[PDB]
Amino acid sequence: SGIKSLELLLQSMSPELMAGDYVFCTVNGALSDYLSLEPIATFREPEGLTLVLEAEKAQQAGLESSALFSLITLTVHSEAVGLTAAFATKLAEHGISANVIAGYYHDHIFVQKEKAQQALQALGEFAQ
Amino acid sequence: MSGIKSLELLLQSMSPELMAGDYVFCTVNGALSDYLSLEPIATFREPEGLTLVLEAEKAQQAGLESSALFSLITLTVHSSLEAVGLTAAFATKLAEHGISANVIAGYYHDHIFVQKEKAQQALQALGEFAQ
């Protein structure tokens, strides 16, 4: 019953592909300097500020970014350990890299834009 | 054959490093600009509100109420934002020891928030290698 409580958690898992193209940038400066860019996500690394922002905004401000990513919010309904291992393994099996940002309420997964539809279908296999 | 490349990554050290500080997760209302003075290490704009990841006592005496304490581990292992198998590898190493991870992918490295009490065990799990 400690085994199968994870399989129950995974069955309640529900992926949601969100709107917008995203890019990861790294900048040097105060977070305050980049507020007008309205980034969805922020991380202060010792190497500099990570901005996750709409690809539109990134090139309007002419930042050297990354490949385009799509955002999948991951919901569970609703607990045990192994959730991240499970969804990341499922994505890995389809040659999809998962760049996860834990928010307060949900896990947010950034996948290659070209692989977004593939990732949604793969993660949607759990609720069956 | 994508599953075998994942296995090869699992069998490697994540080269973990424990960072200074106790961290907490918070959800707040309104603009990030309101909270700049708190100097959050991480930010996420969720539909349900702004997530802030903050030093324990920066959050505590800003009146945001007690969260569970987190330690921060960075993976120094060499990788990009499109290396398939890496999240599965580190997430698996942690799960094998009963450790839940709150992962934030940075531009350069993955950063993992684990419960403060499990910080040394997370280092041990993450630092495991085959050869």
Side-chain angles (χ1 to χ4, degrees):
Chain A
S1 209
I3 333 106
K4 81 99 178 279
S5 82
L6 174 65
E7 309 161 23
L8 253 36
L9 177 82
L10 295 184
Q11 282 177 46
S12 85
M13 178 181 130
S14 176
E16 317 164 344
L17 181 55
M18 319 302 279
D21 297 337
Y22 290 98
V23 282
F24 281 69
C25 305
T26 185
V27 295
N28 296 121
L31 175 55
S32 56
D33 289 326
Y34 297 99
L35 261 274
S36 81
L37 291 177
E38 292 133 56
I40 199 176
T42 268
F43 196 98
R44 176 60 70 176
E45 300 192 299
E47 296 88 353
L49 224 206
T50 292
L51 302 175
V52 183
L53 72 203
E54 297 204 298
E56 183 75 288
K57 270 111 280 295
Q59 59 95 186
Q60 313 280 24
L63 307 170
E64 277 169 33
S65 59
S66 69
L68 307 171
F69 293 93
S70 310
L71 203 212
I72 297 173
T73 296
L74 197 99
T75 64
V76 282
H77 296 278
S78 177
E79 106 278 304
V81 321
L83 175 71
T84 315
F87 75 70
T89 301
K90 175 92 273 199
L91 294 168
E93 281 159 0
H94 291 255
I96 307 171
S97 73
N99 301 290
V100 5
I101 299 179
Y104 190 83
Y105 293 111
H106 302 303
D107 265 336
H108 301 99
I109 312 157
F110 294 81
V111 303
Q112 311 258 216
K113 202 211 161 176
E114 55 153 342
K115 289 190 159 274
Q117 201 56 228
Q118 244 210 114
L120 186 59
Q121 309 319 311
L123 294 180
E125 281 176 30
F126 280 108
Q128 285 143 216
Chain B
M1 201 71 164
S2 211
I4 296 294
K5 291 189 293 260
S6 299
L7 190 250
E8 280 151 8
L9 257 176
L10 214 216
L11 272 31
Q12 287 185 73
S13 181
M14 291 302 98
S15 289
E17 41 169 23
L18 222 219
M19 306 302 125
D22 300 343
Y23 291 93
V24 299
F25 278 66
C26 302
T27 196
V28 291
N29 263 213
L32 210 218
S33 36
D34 300 311
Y35 297 92
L36 255 27
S37 57
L38 297 179
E39 289 153 26
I41 194 177
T43 272
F44 202 102
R45 189 161 42 65
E46 301 190 299
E48 303 81 1
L50 187 72
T51 301
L52 302 171
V53 188
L54 295 150
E55 271 255 50
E57 47 61 73
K58 244 74 137 287
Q60 177 258 298
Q61 29 84 323
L64 315 173
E65 210 209 325
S66 290
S67 165
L69 294 194
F70 290 100
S71 294
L72 166 67
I73 292 162
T74 297
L75 276 15
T76 58
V77 82
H78 5 73
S79 186
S80 58
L81 281 320
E82 46 262 307
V84 37
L86 195 71
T87 304
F90 72 74
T92 298
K93 288 169 163 279
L94 257 11
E96 276 181 85
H97 294 87
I99 302 158
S100 258
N102 311 60
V103 175
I104 310 185
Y107 186 94
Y108 291 108
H109 299 101
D110 291 296
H111 312 276
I112 304 159
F113 295 84
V114 303
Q115 287 170 188
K116 191 199 174 171
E117 273 223 276
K118 281 167 173 174
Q120 295 299 318
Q121 294 103 108
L123 283 183
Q124 283 158 215
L126 290 168
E128 284 166 352
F129 65 91
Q131 211 68 48

